[model samples]
Target: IVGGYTCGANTVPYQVSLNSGYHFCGGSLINSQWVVSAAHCYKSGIQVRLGEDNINVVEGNEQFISASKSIVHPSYNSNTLNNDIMLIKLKSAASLNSRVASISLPTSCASAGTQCLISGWGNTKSSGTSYPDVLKCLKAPILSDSSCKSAYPGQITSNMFCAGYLEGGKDSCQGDSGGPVVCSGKLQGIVSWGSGCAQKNKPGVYTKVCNYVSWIKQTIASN
Candidate 1:
């Protein structure tokens, strides 16, 4: 994540690396076998790496699992980045441990200015070339829906929410797409998209998880 510090190992067990060929995107484990991420992060082939703190080396605690199926939201709008969420079903369930765990989904939508946290291995700077080898984390407070809509004009939607600093800095970047946005210890959002990393008044946008709760439940149950 942009303008963030390196995160401690096992700090966010739900966080996972979505390896799409050579590129890497972030994801969160919502269940033993289900990973939630953004639809735009997908590729032809993908793998999920759990319990991973550093991407440069493999740790004994890490679990690498192949994705059996990828279910993207039907109404995902690429043009305006609406409903930009997806789920990946693993070939086998992940073994739960201190280093591997699932995050609790939000029971209700996050309120305006709710304090939240985001973790990922995305670039440290907006203009940086290389991504961090270790996971990075930052605090991002939820922006009011009205204020967010004002910032993005007609681009904001009900399926999306905004979080970040109004001044600039401290936001999710390119490779952070699909990562978790935890509020009050609940999985509240999925890092979706932004105008640019940590730009003025352009807060990071995320897939509002609460809006899709019913759909997620049905999809997981039937899949």
Candidate 2:
């Protein structure tokens, strides 16, 4: 994330580093065994590292768990980046503690100008390849649907919204997709896509988590 700072080890307890062999995306622990992430990050042999602050070091609190099963949203469209959510069922449940836990789903939609928090290991710049070992955070405020429409121009769907600045100094870039976007301390969005990392008039776009509460609950309940 650009224009961000490193976060504490326990600042984002539910934050997950998704790996097949290396960190590919981020996720949120919604329950002991279920994770909320972006469908676009899907790949075979997926695993998750919970309580991970730095990917380059061995943090004793980190829980390495392989995914037993994963389900992409039935309506997920890669072409348009709509319904970009996914659920991961872990091989085993996390041993929740002070440094490892779950986050609650959003209770309301984030209004325009509502300040939100996004924490992840996404790229730290607008171009080139640069990822951080430590988790980073940005105080991205939710932009209006109208603002997103202007930024994306016929691409912003109801299932997505934009956050960050119009002038674009901070954003969730590559390797951050499927990560959490928290507003009012609730999971409100998921890192999904953008024009580029921290580009002007091209703020970070996220999957609107508030629109899928029933889907998440129903998926977990029936599966």
Candidate 3:
């Protein structure tokens, strides 16, 4: 399988090419010209490889393509790591095939109990080395706005969404940051933060993509 269940934060098909020396979390194909990912993953010289099962280079892909440019959200805050969303411009248009996958961005994606899947090569345990060969995945449920507020108390703001296992043993850990959280296959959120890897009462927090649709659309349009 291309992905195994981990903590569903923001998982998408991708690879950090060692030979190419390019690093990217992963991306969802929007159209022939566009792809969506977290802004933090936006970097120079990175190629967005879609429709691949594993990050292992030997996993041959039919939708392999280099990237022309990476457009990170302008308002993206590197400090608090806020506004962590972005899109990629492919070097050439993609041929829509079974292997080529595109994600639908929904207009209203902040509703409660919205389930999503996240995939990545993040740490399995609470800490230590990140797995490079094996990919993991996990399912997460969208926490209600009120639940989020109550959990963080005064800190839970409008731009953030919460997910992951509340009892622990599951979460979006390091290297999983800036990944995709998909609800019904639509891009919903990007892994942002939490108390730790996976802690009790501290599910993973993410930047809600639906709340910043205007900015994402306009930024993509401008580029």
Model 2 clashes, total count: 0
* lDDT score of residue 61 within candidate 1: 90
- RMSD, candidate 3, Å: 4.0
Q: Candidate 1 lDDT, tens digit per residue, 28-122?
A: 99999999999988775788999898787876798989999999899987898888999999999999988899998889998998999999988
The whole-model C-alpha lDDT of candidate 2 against the native structure comes to 0.91
Candidate 2, 1-223: lDDT as tens digits: 8889999777999999999788999999998999999999999999899999989899689899999999999999989999999999999999999999899998778899989889899889886878898999989889888888988898999999999998877888998999999888799999999998899999889999999999999989998
Residue 215 in candidate 2, Cα distance off native in Å: 0.7
Best by TM-score: 2
lDDT by residue for model 3 (1-223), tens = 1123532211343322211353336455677767766776666776655555455655554456788887777788876667777777888887765555466777786578878887666666675555654456677889877777767776666778888766777787766666668888677887677776776787788888888778767777887
Candidates 1 and 3: which is better by TM-score? Answer: 1
* Model 3 error, position 12 (Å): 6.6
Top of the candidates by lDDT = 2
Model 1 collision count? 0
The parts of candidate 2 lying over 4 Å away from their true place are none
lDDT of 3: 0.66
Cα shift from native, residue 210, model 2 (Å): 1.0
What is the Å distance of residue 183 in model 1 from its true position? 0.6
